[PDB]
Design a protein around this ligand. Structure first.
Ligand SMILES: Nc1ncnc2c1ncn2[C@@H]1O[C@H](COP(=O)(O)OP(=O)(O)O)[C@@H](O)[C@H]1O
Ligand SMILES: [Mg+2]
Ligand SMILES: [Mg+2]
Length: 212
């Protein structure tokens, strides 16, 4: 009754919009977690402003064609990327959207492959990648996506599993990055990414994030 076998451009737009709203609602929390590389209190603000730049382009130029919608989202992120986290987020989504540029809709396997493509783009963009960060969480989420999509057609079930595994990775970040364990926090960039992913899931279920 509620399975998602294909994601068109409007469903992707909904994922973007609900992910952006969920991040906005949690931006102050994500800011306060920020300790790496400097505790300058801005991860949530940076990611929120970057995501908002993408969301605004999407809201003004919707399409049934997921590839075209992805081009619109990607351009918005890339012209408004703020801070280390916003730049990395924009590169994750640049690679994700490039992977689907020629599609009108995608299935669960192409969704998983697009997460992986985003990870590859983001790691290549960062000259000195550090583990325990948004890169680690994205990498572990994408590996989970590939494994699960191999026998899961339903994108809701797939995204639920991605979130379980992304949360496990996020909770493991202090075991990779010393300052996180010393201060007693998880990685702020990774937390912001989880906020986006949890909005993706709401949209796949046809639900909306309540605006704080
Ligand atoms: N070298 C790096 N490798 C991977 N992720 C990084 C790196 N540097 C920063 N990050 C990510 O960026 C987050 C901090 O984002 P942000 O506060 O926007 O950065 P800044 O304020 O230093 O520009 C970190 O929690 C981490 O997820
Ligand atoms: Mg900063
Ligand atoms: Mg910061």
């Amino acid at each position: 009754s509620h399975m998602i076998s294909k994601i068109n451009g409007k469903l992707f737009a909904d994922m973007i919009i609900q992910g952006a709203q969920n991040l906005s609602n949690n931006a102050d929390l994500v800011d306060s977690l920020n300790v790496y590389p400097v505790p300058d209190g801005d991860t949530g603000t940076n990611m929120n402003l970057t995501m908002t730049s993408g969301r605004e382009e999407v809201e003004n130029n919707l399409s049934k064609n997921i590839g075209e919608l992805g081009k619109t989202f990607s351009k918005g992120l890339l012209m408004g990327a703020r801070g280390n986290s916003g730049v990395i987020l924009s590169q994750l989504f640049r690679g994700f959207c490039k992977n689907i540029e020629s599609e009108s809709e995608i299935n669960s396997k192409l969704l998983a492959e697009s997460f992986q493509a985003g990870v590859e783009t983001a790691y290549k963009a960062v000259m000195k990648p550090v583990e325990g960060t948004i890169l680690t969480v994205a990498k572990d989420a994408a590996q989970a996506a590939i494994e699960k999509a191999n026998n899961t057609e339903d994108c809701i079930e797939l995204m639920e599993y991605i979130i379980v595994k992304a949360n496990e990775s996020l909770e493991n970040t202090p075991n990779l990055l010393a300052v996180l364990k010393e201060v007693g926090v998880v990685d702020s960039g990774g937390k912001g990414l989880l906020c986006v992913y949890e909005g993706f899931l709401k949209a796949l279920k046809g639900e909306k994030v309540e605006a704080k």
